[PDB]
Design a binder for this molecule. Structure first.
Ligand SMILES: Nc1ncnc2c1ncn2[C@@H]1O[C@H](COP(=O)(O)OP(=O)(O)OC[C@H]2O[C@H](O)[C@H](O)[C@@H]2O)[C@@H](O)[C@H]1O
Ligand SMILES: CC(/C=C/C(=O)NO)=C\[C@@H](C)C(=O)c1ccc(N(C)C)cc1
Ligand SMILES: [Zn+2]
Length: 281
């Protein structure tokens, strides 16, 4: 708990030089076009451009703790905006290029971006979500719920119940939400393409899900500034900023990154929008 293994922290960053970065993003476009079922895996690296620190980056939460320094927030969680990467993921879902989305992030930004909760596994919880210990009914709040480790927030259930509301933030010893883990695993096993964005892939089982795609000859793409646990298993490793990589990908795909309306919750994926015709590859 105090001795919890925080893994490899503060590994050097790697930057693909510009011609190499351009060729690898063109190859990522090629895999998306060819794949039937694409699953995205996100971690803390996709929120660092919103001013939320990651865990194991050069200035991450655990890296700084290890050096006796403090991580720095440039926002609250309430005032944070979805990155270009978050809104790209909204669009790829809408046009049906993204089958499912698996996140380790607690920052509440996939939800708040309007990403459909029925295509989202939030494996480590959501700072904005409390759940009735009685009926399991979830509430997505406009402010962080105020506790971590699955404690009583002090609020009660309002479903026609009065059950005790608790946070959904897992502590080190807490096993993963069964529904979210089972859907993420099923999505990962069934995928022919798994793309990792801003996760070092050091947590079990979260970080191991993308390896399930390798079963039955799926492809694995890892986008990350630092080395990751599964680098040797990747068909393609892109070392660059996830916003640079995703803006370029969207341009190759002929998709706009959509406007953020402000914090909005979508329970269920809408009908799929029209998408560009595919290139002859
Ligand atoms: N803008 C960026 N572009 C690309 N890569 C980035 C960027 N920002 C950071 N990175 C990389 O993004 C990667 C983030 O790795 P980690 O910090 O381990 O976060 P996790 O989500 O995988 O942490 C998993 C869990 O462990 C924790 O205890 C919590 O429970 C977490 O939920 C780093 O390698 C950065 O190099
Ligand atoms: C960075 C982050 C989420 C990022 C995210 O979700 N990015 O997408 C959450 C902070 C609140 C954090 O988790 C933390 C945990 C334990 C701790 N101590 C045990 C002292 C100190 C801080
Ligand atoms: Zn209830």
């Amino acid at each position: 708990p105090f001795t919890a293994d925080k893994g490899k922290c503060g590994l050097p960053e790697i930057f693909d030089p510009p011609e190499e970065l351009e060729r690898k993003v063109w190859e990522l476009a090629r895999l998306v076009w060819q794949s039937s079922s694409v699953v995205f895996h996100t971690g803390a690296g996709i929120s660092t451009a919103s001013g939320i620190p990651d865990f194991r980056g050069p200035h991450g939460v655990w890296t700084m703790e290890e050096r006796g320094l403090a991580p720095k927030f440039d926002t609250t969680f309430e005032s944070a905006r979805p990155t270009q990467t978050h809104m790209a993921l909204v669009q790829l879902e809408r046009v049906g290029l993204l089958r499912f989305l698996v996140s380790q992030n607690v920052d509440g930004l996939h939800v708040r971006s309007g990403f459909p909760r029925d295509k989202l596994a939030e494996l480590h919880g959501n700072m904005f979500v409390e759940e009735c210990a009685k009926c399991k009914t979830q509430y997505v709040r406009d402010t962080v719920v105020g506790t971590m480790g699955l404690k009583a927030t002090g609020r009660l259930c309002t479903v026609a119940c009065r059950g005790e509301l608790r946070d959904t933030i897992l502590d080190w010893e807490d096993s993963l939400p069964d529904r979210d883990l089972a859907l993420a695993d099923e999505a990962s096993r069934n995928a022919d393409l798994s793309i990792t964005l801003g996760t070092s892939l050091q947590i079990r089982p979260s970080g191991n899900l993308p390896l399930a795609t390798k079963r039955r000859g799926g492809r694995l793409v890892i986008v990350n500034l630092q080395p990751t646990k599964h680098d040797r298993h990747a068909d393609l490793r892109i070392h660059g900023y996830v916003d640079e990589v995703m803006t370029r990908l969207m341009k190759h795909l002929g998709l706009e990154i959509p406007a953020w309306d402000g914090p909005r919750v979508l329970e269920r994926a809408l009908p799929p929008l029209p998408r560009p015709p595919t290139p002859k590859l």
